[PDB]
Amino acid sequence: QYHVEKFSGLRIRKPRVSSSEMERKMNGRKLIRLAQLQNKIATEKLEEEDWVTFGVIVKKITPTFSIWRLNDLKDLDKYISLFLFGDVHKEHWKTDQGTVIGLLNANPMKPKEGTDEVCLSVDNPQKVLLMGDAVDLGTCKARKKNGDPCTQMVNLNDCEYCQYHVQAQYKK
Ligand SMILES: [Zn+2]
């Protein structure tokens, strides 16, 4: 049914970019995983690279500009916030939660008080590449102590249990 798209490592439902269009989008570019962005910025090694990263929209908020919480579904505990302003917001703000995106050459922002999460914005709506729906974006199958469903996010293709609940499945 679905293939692991090579650059993101995600199985995509209804892919919007062909394999050749991705090849030319990636040509000559540095792939940097989301989890590496903090360190790259802190050591000022980010700007000199023509770079791309991948993440899925896991949360949206639109207070006019908007923010997307991104996670790449490979390192499950690492998140960035992407801020959409102007043209980018206008073009892209209605995009579905669960969308896989390539993010290219975004600009680091001031830290958002209380969180050590990388915040980035983007010059230009062409630095956002919509790749399709993340078929394996799901919720943890375990329950909390009180019987409520766990709400932690999961990559269904790799593990059906979040970090906290595997810690306990492994001890079984
Ligand atoms: Zn869980």
Curated annotation (Swiss-Prot):
Region named Zinc finger-like 1: 140-165
Compartment(s) of residence: Nucleus
Region (OB-fold domain): 1-139
Assembly with partners or alone: Self-associates.
Free-text note on domains in this protein's UniProt record: Each zinc finger-like domain binds a zinc ion and is involved in both ssDNA and dsDNA binding, as is the OB-fold domain.
Family recorded in the similarity comment: Belongs to the MCM10 family.
Protein function: Acts as a replication initiation factor that brings together the MCM2-7 helicase and the DNA polymerase alpha/primase complex in order to initiate DNA replication. Additionally, plays a role in preventing DNA damage during replication.
Protein name: Protein MCM10 homolog
Organism expressing this protein natively: Xenopus laevis
Residues represented out of the complete protein: 235 to 413 of 860
